[model samples]
Target: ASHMKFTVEREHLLKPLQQVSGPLGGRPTLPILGNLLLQVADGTLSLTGTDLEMEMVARVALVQPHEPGATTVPARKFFDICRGLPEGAEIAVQLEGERMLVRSGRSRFSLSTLPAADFPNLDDWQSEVEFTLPQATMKRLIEATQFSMAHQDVRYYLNGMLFETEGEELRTVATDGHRLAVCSMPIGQSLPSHSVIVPRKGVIELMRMLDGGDNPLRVQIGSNNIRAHVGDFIFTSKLVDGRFPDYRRVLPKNPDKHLEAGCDLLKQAFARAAILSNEKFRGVRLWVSENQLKITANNPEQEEAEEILDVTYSGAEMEIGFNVSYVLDVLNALKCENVRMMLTDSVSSVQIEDAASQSAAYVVMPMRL
Candidate 1:
């Protein structure tokens, strides 16, 4: 015979609920995992959602406060009901036994409820290290490298992004055997050296929550979990339990030849040349000589595409093959006016970096066409 009641504006409640509930997996093993835990107290309404490995909690102010209580209801149905209400509508919610009632305008609905105590809670681990940085910095670190993470690769560790901290600098690295991406930025505070692997799913969910603003975001790293506090939202995710590759060993050093080209022009040329690339290999050949670079691709049907761009190169003439999509990915992620490419030979890996900043780098292995 538990009693609970609250009144909240539709927009206020709906947005926060949607944000927290979005991470819940569609195929939850337990009924409670598909429900959102709702709690009201101190003139605020809080909602929480989880999928065993990760959890999100968000809170918003209530329009009219009532007795403090908690309950759980199907997240999808509850959100839909609130979203469908008329503009500027105020929602009234009440709980009776194992059922929850919702009222708005002339519409009323009863939803089956689950005991709030049944919902599993994330571990309250004592954070080994805690720090805060601009949300934009965190977002950039993720976006610049996350695209290179492997998708369900047999090497389970490659399916995650490596977060490594050395002193005041934090570096994020991702690789999928064929190519690798690395991005780093200073955190202003010297932190003890540590590293962790964040699975692909967690990286994606966290990126969606980041708005790349100047707001300060607090981050905590534990032995097994990572937590972030951004405004009214709290995000917690489990760390992938595996060792990442030794990326430094793969980085090329002191290549003999270097060339600079317009990032936009290179991206456009790669896109056009990819049109006739082999559907299975997606290989494109690059011929470099003097101050010009030629890109060529041909499919099995004998169709061919070619693009030539002027560059600043006076190195040894060479031809190399690579997956056009891999080159385009790096160009697309970089926000730079020009790109610098360094190479030693036609068979060695090519290194690309921002011509201005050098804060990020990408390496693509040569392919045999």
Candidate 2:
């Protein structure tokens, strides 16, 4: 009877199981990749899962401590079984050879198990830099810039977000060939300048985990990996091994035309015009004057749409073209009252910012009409 036993409330097991199962990926070739490694020791239960690119481990106090042992169980089947159990029922688990038996009252289920020793762990390295920041701050950093990241791009570096820390400032940048996003905030302490490219998957995973609360989270940066301790989970991911482009060079220097208008109004105006935009091109035209802005769209079927709105503008009369969805994306991400547009000319890229806060800045290239 060289096995292990523990009795836990259904609620205690379900939540932690869901947290750890998040990183489970589609690895049909390897059976162990679809399983979660469960370990019980020192009065706590730890559940760990990984897709080989990222890993998350969540720990909770064991309701009934017992003999310590480790095993790998099918992450999906186990969680489903626990979730279907009656509320407030106690789940007593026992490991016997190749089966893990779960018993509640007279109901019982046996799940196949794999040896924990065969599970894979992410390669570990000493973190060269460590720091802490409010969870809200980290959430803000990722949400503002995550949208502009490219997917399946040949320039692999552009498919991720750049995390750069220097002096007392921390910044994030994401871009596709046509548009770019930048957000920066003040850190509590001064640190030497350094940059890391977090792959698209890692950025999306971290964004899901953060709750935008005031609680602090610790971040550690290694040469090949980046890790964060958020709430009860330890999140780790392999960094993209490449260099990001110099973002500063993309901003329009000394933009000439400036206009301020309601964010919602502009979004609505764009939405109507988008219906007539070329299906594949998704292009929209903008005509700006001293105090009015015009939006127009045309499709191959000869359908046309136009919208005019009043705005605060005192610059030269100009007409420019842009990707309709690109502007709408920046607008959705802003979520502020008013947006200010800074423009240089027909062919140059335009910058968009929140009229009052300016917490995030966006650059969208002018499409040829």
Candidate 3:
């Protein structure tokens, strides 16, 4: 259906649209469905896209006098056109039957279109609960746990992060089966208890849209979807329909001892030791003592490397092996200068945390070298 069109600021209208379009999974078989649906009404522009497992909608301010209109265009191509335009250039959109012309300054581009009817549309998302949080908090939560999400996991459901909001606290947990990472934040408003499994790709895209600032972030969980607004960017994703594993069941209730050390020092020692370890195992050993930690790694040739870090622990001395990558991953996510490691034995799980940050923790499984 054809309708009226008008001009608008390119950045204000296209920035959010581009952010939402970045997550579209353009499989070869679904060529036509990879594009975003663009709709203009009153003085606003709404853009939407989905890959079934995930969906996104971005709304922006616009200037218009005519009725609404809808169209489907190549998602990336449309975004590049707006992005490449010079500053302060007025963008005009004119529909000519099946063709749409975009003019900015003296540059004109024509983009081919697929009929709006040909595009696939998902069902409406009905809101079941709502919550509000600061954008900085939301960004922090994602950053602290996003690195642990499994990609292309055989479990299918474990490839994403688990999202749950209880009372005033919103939490995100991610794991790759071998390790678990959790981040929690307390919002000012209470939301109905709800949980959603977000796909790995969607979680990454959501993280990219959150700018480093103190803006408020609004979160809404629908019957089968989750949506959040960060600054001018709005991200919406479909909830994975499978049950996430009960993470608490696997967590160690009583790790025998706690080892506290400088996060940077531990990360550096692990990095150095990992170089001499077996490529496949990436294994490193740690011997903990009263006020010192001995780290060791060796290859098949029996060549060994070791380092000790100053720690503040008076627990019994013990040695344990772990995947170097896993330990480094935990240290990299921690934002505090000092972190504590909880261990029971050479074969038990290793838990890492910022003693000052009660809202975040990481659990890593030990490996046999």
Candidate 4:
């Protein structure tokens, strides 16, 4: 007495299914974790996949619908079958006992199924704060700060990105012990302040699914998790249970030397200078003086690289060392014409920011060469 059936356009079904299934891989402890729960009701189909830590739910309009029922089928295999089929093909899915059937043109697939009742749902946590923002703004905030997140660091809190909101402003920050990035935006709503640390994987997966468009996204911040609603898709992820460092304390307030240089020119020089940098330390020395900047690197193999570029600086001569890769990452993340660097001698951290805007800022600790 199995009665689940639906017909959907292969293109319409495949894209959303792929997005929900993309984060559902790896050796899941439960067999059901590798499958997507498919539910058909009221002429609409919903696909859901979860890894306990994160969940993605996608809905699509059914071309044809029959009796309402639900079942779980192998997400990857099901997606693969549809992907391999001809374009614009119509896919019919039906359930038969403990197996699921899929058909398209001359291709047919019989996939094992589990009862939808067995699929675990995320805990019902009450959200303390909720807001809405353009999907593009959210995506931009993440893109500007995600690169500084620590990976497998001893300080587990550093392994995620901090999201804080106050009044009409939203801010994102990420930092390894060596470097930090911060980005902010105004949401145009007066609200109480809230903070959460979205686990690294959650930030990464959210970025992957977010479209750089003008669509609005609703976000909910809960005690143990966060959820986002984007069109017909819902994304939920568990939050990291820890306090993030006070990022404001890390940003340099005043520096004696300030220099502005073309981001492209600096990137090119760093790329060439990096070739001679120590493979392990990747340290490149920056010598800044009145109206000029010099970058130099030396490896243990007795090789050296030096590049001198003209700049809009009139400060006293100062020498500092930084990891070439760290600086390069900031430059790559920032889509800007020029970058401003603030320095306070060789022992302190340096701040780099877009010369044209204050929306994003980057800080990198100086390294001893």
Give lDDT per model, in order. 0.89, 0.89, 0.80, 0.90
The digit string of per-residue lDDT tens for model 1 on 1-369 reads 257789888878866877888678577599999999988888887899998888889888776767688999999999999999998999999997789999988899999999988988987887888889888899989999998999999999899899888889889999999999999999999998889898888888787778536658898988889888887888889998887887788788778889899999999999999999998899999999999999999999999999999998998999999999999999999978999999888788999999998789999999976
Instruction: Write out the backbone clash pairs for model 4.
Output: none
TM-score, every prediction: 0.95, 0.96, 0.93, 0.96
**Range of the 10 consecutive residues with the lowest summed lDDT in candidate 3:** 25-34
Tell me the lDDT of model 1 at 120: 82
* Candidate 4 residue-wise lDDT, 138-228, digit = tens: 9889999999999989888889999999779999999998999999999988767998999898898888778636668899998889998
TM-score of candidate 1 against the unseen true structure: 0.95
What candidate 3 gets wrong by more than 4 Å, as runs, is 64-67, 212-214, 231-233, 301-303
Ranking by TM-score: 4, 2, 1, 3
Best by lDDT: 4
lDDT of 3 by residue, 1-369 (tens): 386365777867666766768667546557666677777886777777767666667776775554478887788887889888887767887666777778887898888877777777667878888777776787888889988888888787788889988888889999888999988888877767887998888888777777637767777788687777776566777777777876677677799898899988888999999888878888888899989999999999888889978899988898888989888888888967999998898888988999787788899999875
- Models, CA RMSD each: 1.7, 1.7, 2.1, 1.5
lDDT at position 72, candidate 1: 94
Best of the two (1, 2) by TM-score = 2
